């Protein structure tokens, strides 16, 4: 079926893997290059065999190509994709006056307590960027994140530089070009970022009228992270073709190191055992084309009829 | 063998590559997306179906290292590789008096008394750059090319980074680590550029003790550049192993678009008629480390024995 590259990765990790000692103190079984294509044609590549959170999809990548940074949009769609980045913030504020906090995540996946005393804080700071605007302003902005990257790289000169709204113009003026390239890695801030991007580059490829993208990523959660980057970046492909008036290609996903915490074995072989089901079908807004101005009541998913959700510990 | 990977993407590239319009005059059968991996263990990868001049692959490799962008270097080696592109700064100079030499090349591989008058003047132009420190300093110095890249990325606090040379030390300290990436695409430059980076950008992977590198090939001439790049990458990463005194894994070349000339199929067809033979084997100075202090003498080749040479047009 259409979501088989998939399942083959996890399969191959599996067989292949070699043990490597991830920065945290989950293990991971890792691969390093890797190369899946998807026809855009026959079907939405989001899976069957596991329910995927579309609505988290969406909100998530309308949010990038608005070129935001804050939280807030975020949260007012339901969103918590973000929260502990700015929320790891709030804690490390001067001004943060509460719990400790310190290490989380780590130890709120132990103590439970402690979970709930976390849980708590976090909710007053969800409600707080939802309605203090000082707040949100000060540490719901994350800035250096893919909406950025995209729409405002910083130059020199002190300028900014939209680098999906240039690429874009040139797929419509120059669709030949080997040079739609978008880039989310910069030297200078690599360095001192606390998540350097994963979704590291990509390059939109235009062809007898159908639009192609390849996304190269260095690191890559294949249980709880993949299926997620699969329909952004389909649906990212689905939205330029659409503004364009060209026809949608394949997504090409290229991996630098795939890999599988330990903690997840279980569940990938469990999902396995699944045999995928037709694929559902994307629909977006004939009366409108400019996809910077689009709103979730434009895209629509049909007939997407999952296997039920396959829950796991996030490795941390 | 070896280089089966090669061969294989030659011919898919003529079983199943679109005809796309290159930017040229020359049309291209090309593809989107496509990945190769070369085993180290096996061999150097410098192709045995047809001879490679493995002199130019060291000398500019080298010059990349020293984050060198001075022609001077190349032609005290004897290396022409990247001439036209100093050259036309000098033809486009407002203190350039002599012949026309506008549209050259596409000229040049017409009007054969014009590629007389052409090659008269490159000669001289070539002499300068080797005595006149001044001349060199101002028309022999490219600047934005991969050695600056590399090793001089230009920070907005007027500063300048080592990307390689950070990058390895990062291999010392931190072998596991997913972010050992090194980009030569830079959007605020991108644009203005006569020719953006072909070699957009490559990561490193330790595992086992063993190191691997991938790089991310946006646009490839599958008959005249690809088989130089398969070495020069191949030998970056033995470069590096040999500093950091680890193994050699494997190189894993992905490209965006793979694109053959067309004034090139009768030559690649033929190439194919041949059988590869063993590989040669590279051979680096022991009681040296420091890589980026090397010199041709300190890099060797052991048992090359290709076929003969395989001429063809450059398309352009
Ligand atoms: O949806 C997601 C979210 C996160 N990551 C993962 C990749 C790595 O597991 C971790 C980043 O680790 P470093 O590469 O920074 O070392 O985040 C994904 O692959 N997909
Ligand atoms: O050794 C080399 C030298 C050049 N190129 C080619 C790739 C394209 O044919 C051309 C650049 O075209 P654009 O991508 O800039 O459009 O140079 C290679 O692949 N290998």
Chains 1, 2 share one sequence.
């Not at 590259?5 to 103190?25: C, M, N």
């Not at 001004?95 to 804080?121: I, L, N, W």
């Not at 002190?158 to 113009?169: A, F």
């Not at 101005?293 to 049909?302: E, N, S, T, V, W």
Request: proline share 6%; charged share 25%; hydrophobic share 40%.
């Amino acid at each position: 079926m259409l979501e088989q590259p998939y399942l083959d990765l996890a399969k191959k990790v599996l067989d292949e893997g070699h043990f490597k000692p991830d920065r945290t103190h989950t293990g991971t079984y890792s691969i390093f290059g890797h190369q899946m294509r998807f026809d855009l044609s026959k079907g939405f590549p989001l899976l069957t065999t596991k329910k995927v959170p579309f609505g988290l999809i969406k909100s998530e990548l309308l949010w990038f190509l608005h070129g935001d940074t804050n939280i807030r949009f975020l949260l007012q769609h339901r969103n918590h994709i973000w929260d502990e980045w700015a929320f790891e913030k709030w804690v490390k504020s001067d001004e943060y006056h509460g719990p400790d906090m310190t290490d989380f995540g780590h130890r709120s996946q132990k103590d439970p307590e402690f979970a709930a005393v976390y849980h708590e804080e976090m909710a007053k700071f969800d409600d707080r960027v939802l309605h203090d605007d000082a707040f949100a302003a000060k540490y719901g902005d994350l800035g250096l994140v893919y909406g950025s990257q995209w729409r405002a790289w910083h130059t020199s000169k002190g300028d900014t530089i939209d680098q999906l709204g240039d690429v874009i113009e040139q797929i419509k003026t120059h669709p030949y070009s080997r040079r739609l390239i978008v880039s989310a890695w910069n030297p200078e801030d690599v360095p001192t970022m606390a998540l350097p991007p994963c979704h590291t580059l990509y390059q939109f490829y235009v062809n007898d009228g159908k639009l192609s993208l390849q996304l190269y990523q260095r690191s890559a959660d294949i249980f709880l992270g993949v299926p997620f980057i699969i329909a952004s970046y389909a649906l990212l492909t689905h939205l330029v073709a659409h503004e364009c008036g060209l026809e949608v290609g394949e997504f090409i996903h290229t991996f630098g190191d795939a890999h599988l915490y330990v903690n997840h074995l279980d569940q990938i072989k469990e999902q396995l055992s699944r045999t995928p089901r037709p694929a559902p079908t994307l629909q977006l807004n004939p009366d409108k084309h400019d996809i910077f101005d689009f709103d979730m009541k434009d895209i629509k998913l049909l007939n997407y009829d999952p296997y039920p959700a396959i829950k796991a510990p996030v490795a941390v």
